[PDB]
Structures are given as structure tokens and as C-alpha cells.
From a paper:
The Sec translocon provides the lipid bilayer entry for ribosome‐bound nascent chains and thus facilitates membrane protein biogenesis. The translocon, an integral membrane protein itself, builds a protein‐conducting channel in the lipid bilayer and allows either transmembrane passage of nascent polypeptide chains or their partitioning into the lipid environment as transmembrane α‐helices (TMHs). The central subunit of the translocon, SecY in bacteria or Sec61α in eukaryotes, consists of 10 TMHs arranged as a pseudo‐symmetric “clam‐shell” with a protein‐conducting pore between the N‐ and C‐terminal parts 3, 4. SecY is stabilized at the periphery by the essential subunit SecE/Sec61γ that contains two α‐helices, one in interfacial and one in transmembrane topologies.
Here, we present a cryo‐electron microscopy‐based structure of bacterial translocon SecYEG in lipid nanodiscs and elucidate an early intermediate state upon insertion of the FtsQ anchor domain. Thus, we used an extended scaffold protein MSP1E3D1 and POPG/POPC lipids to reconstitute SecYEG into nanodiscs with a diameter of approximately 12 nm. Thus, to investigate an early stage of the TMH insertion, we prepared translation‐stalled ribosomes, which exposed the first 48 amino acids of FtsQ, including the TMH within the nascent chain, and incubated those with a 10‐fold excess of SecYEG‐ND to achieve complex formation. After sorting and refinement steps, the ribosome structure was resolved at 3.3 Å, and independent refinement of the SecYEG‐ND:RNC complex elements led to 3.2 and 3.1 Å resolution for the small (30S) and large (50S) ribosomal subunits, respectively, and was limited to 6 Å for the lipid‐embedded SecYEG due to its small size and apparent dynamics relative to the 50S ribosomal subunit. In spite of the loose binding of SecYEG to the RNC and its higher flexibility, the complete architecture of essential SecY and SecE subunits was resolved, and a single‐helix density proximate to the SecY N‐terminal domain was assigned to TMH 2 of the SecG subunit, while TMH 1 could not be reliably detected. However, our structure revealed a very different organization of the complex, as SecE TMHs formed a helical hairpin in close proximity to SecY C‐terminal domain, and the hairpin was tilted within the lipid bilayer by ~30°. Surprisingly, the periplasmic loop of the SecE helical hairpin reached TMH 8 and a short helix connecting TMHs 7 and 8 of SecY, and so appeared in direct contact with the lateral gate of the translocon, thus suggesting a potential role of SecE in the translocon gating mechanism but also explaining interactions of SecE with nascent TMHs soon after their membrane partitioning.
Author numbering:
A (entry chain E): 1 to 18, 21 to 41, 60 to 118
B (entry chain Y): 18 to 37, 43 to 296, 300 to 426
Write the structure that this text describes.
Amino acid sequence: XXXXXXXXXXXXXXXXXXXXXXXXXXXXXXXXXXXXXXXLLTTKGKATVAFAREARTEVRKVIWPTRQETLHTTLIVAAVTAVMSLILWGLDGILVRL
Amino acid sequence: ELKRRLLFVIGALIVFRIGSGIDAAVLAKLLEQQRGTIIEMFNMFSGGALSRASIFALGIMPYISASIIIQLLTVVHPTLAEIKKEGESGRRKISQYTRYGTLVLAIFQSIGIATGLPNMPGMQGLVINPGFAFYFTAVVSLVTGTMFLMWLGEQITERGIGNGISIIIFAGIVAGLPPAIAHTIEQARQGDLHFLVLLLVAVLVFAVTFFVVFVERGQRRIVVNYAKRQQGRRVYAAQSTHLPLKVNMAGVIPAIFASSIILFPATIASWFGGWNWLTTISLYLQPGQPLYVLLYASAIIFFCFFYTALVFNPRETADNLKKSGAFVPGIRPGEQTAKYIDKVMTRLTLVGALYITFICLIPEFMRDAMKVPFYFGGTSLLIVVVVIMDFMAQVQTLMMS
């Protein structure tokens, strides 16, 4: 079961189409994906399916919407970005000035 | 003290950001050009080393590029697989051999430039011509600069805090920002930049950061229980304490790694005119194409598995749990608990690096739609938010101590 990656290769070459050599390279790598698919892939499929059950299991640890922790994070990163920018200004204004 | 470690690293990186035969104005003209998106990428990775035309032009990118290489030598060359696993001694000889691969990589990369990039006093300058005295002085100044940065980063990882190099480039791009935003608001009074799209890029930046911090909010805490009565009789409970295991670690390692491995072959390999097929392949190697970012992603996730597997050593953690007196009722201690935490941590962190690659890919489509390049990039937004978050959490964490 390596089929979905090759369908994704078809989709990625179709995205790369719309200027001929790059679309040909995307098609060539899609052909390489099919060559890998010509002959583990079903075990990779079942592994990723297991990983998606694990994903959901780990979704249960994802903290649901909180506007407060959002604003905490928000203001933290806004503050930190302002800090780095003030660092950057204190350095490059007088350094470029000099 | 602890106050002096932070103000020593701060001072070191402040004279780094001041110090960070080629007429540089010509290059400053060349960086206003599309179709080589990777140049702008080199000024992010360089946080502006080739915009400022630094003395160290590509930075610390060779060093990180060796740290992956050796991990291959752990796999291949079992004689090498035995010396990597050989314990304490031998490792500092491997670290000096990583240094010696770096140094021959800086030699090799200077060859790659002065063969590949130049062959014109626009790409070169007036003092440094295609003679081997100019070639040699060029290589000498660029390798001496990268060595200075290598030594300074071997003093800051040890007697200073964390990484540092991340923050070096990071402050290079934040201080590269005000002209770039000056240009955007000059083109905002022009119809080049439309005001709807520019506030759209400001809000997509804000919502991707929100997604980052949402991936950071819920982690996964495993409640383990301790039944403990201290023999002093001041006995209260059987207490269930969660181990709040966290996702992706201390600087997304395959992003920085993958970026060094992206930017090495486009200068050295693809720039050989004299061979022609190799030059054509280098020209194709443009990050306007989905193939490169897919292969980079596959690299990153595999590399992420490896790096994370490096970070934790689950048996020590498990021994600690036996030492600290907590138990998950029903699972055999040791290997089964080991195997358990390992499979689960893999399955989580893999999803983490996946969504990391998802937040990584979209800004590039934003950069195709807007015309953005190595500036607001899908790789660097994430790494800057996580370095700042990490260090301030580690600062509060070590402020309790």
C-alpha cells in the first residue's frame, strides 16, 4: 500500500505544471514513486494507520480552545518579538550609523 | 555567577552582531533579484552575513552539516559503529574529527565558491581577481572568520547557555527586518503592495504563531502514581503526579539541519559551468518546486526520529521512575515500560514534526503569492518562536532553582 503517495505525486506534479522542464522532473519523480510501487508498503500503511490511532490518542492530550492561554502565549510572543526587535534596533541603528 | 553567564553570552553575541575585494554594493544590487530565492535564504541562514558582506559569509552551516554526517558514520562503518558506542574517550576524538571534517568542508566550500560563483568582478570585486593569490587570501579570510565563529560557539555551548547560533542568525534577520518593512510600506503607498494583502500577511503570521502555541499548549502528561509514606509518620497520601512529557525539542533540529543541507549543494555543485549537465541540474534545484520541499520534509521527519532518539535515553528515565518511587499499575518495569514510553513518544513527536512541516510549507506558498523569499520564511518563523519560547521557559525553570 504505497498508492496514496503516488496519487500525491500526481497532485504535486499537477501543482508544478501551471516552464516545461520542472513539470517533467515532477512527473519523473512520480514515475520513480511508481517504480517503488512496482514490486513493506502495506506495512507502512498499517503503521501510519496505527500512527493515526496514536494521533487521536495524542489529540486527547491536545489542550482545547482557551482564549486566555491563547492571549498568554500571544502576549508572551509579542513581548519577546518586541525584545528581539529592540535588541536589533539598539544594535543595527548605531552600527549602521557608524 | 548565573548573572555573568547570561551577560557574557549577551556581550559575545553583541560583538558578533557588530562584526557580522568584493565590491559589496554590487551584491546589495544582486539581492534585489528573484529566481535565486536561495540567496535571500542565505541571508536568513546568515541572518545577513552576505547582505552585510561579512567576513564569515555562510556562518556555522558547515559545523551542523558535520553533526549529521557522523550520525551516518554511526550507522555505516561498524568499525565506526564500535568507536561511536565506545563510551567517554574516543568521543572527543570524534568531535575533533567532526572539526576536521568541518575544516575540510570549509576548504571545499571555498573552492566551490571561487570555482563556481565568481568569474566576474561583479560577483567578485576589484582586489580579488581570478588569481591564486587573491583566491588564497579570499579562502584565508573566509575560513578564518568561520573558525572564529566555531571557537566562540565552542565556548558558548559549554560555559554559556544553550545553542546561541540560532539566536545569532535570528538577531541578524530581526535587524535585517526594518529596511524590509520600510520597503513594504513604501510599496504600500505604491500599488505594488496592496494594503489588503499586507495585512493578510500580518494576520497569517499571527495565526501560524497561534497554531504553534496551540501545539505547545496541550502536550501529553502521563499520570504515574507514588504511594509513599515517609517513615517520619507525617504521612499524607498516595499521590498521582503526571509526567508532562513534551513534544519536539530544543530547537527543531532537522529544520536547521535540513536548511544547512539545502544550501550547501546549490552553491558548490550547481555552479559548475565547466559539467554542463551538473550546472543544468543546479539551475533546476530551485525552491519554487514541490519536489525539493517534499524530499526535505522526508529528510526532516527521518532526522527528527533520529535526533529525538538521541535526546532522551529512556532507560535512565525509567530507572529514575523506579528510583523516584512511582508506578503505573499493571505494566512490567524496565524494558516493557521502556518500550512503552518509546513507542508512544515516537508516535507523538512524529505527529509534532509533521505539523511542523505543515506550518513550514504554507509560508512558501505565501511567498509565491506575495513574492516573498528568504525573509518571512516557513522555516525561520517556527524556529524563532520556539527559541524565544524555549529560552524563556528554561529561564523561568532555572529561575525557580
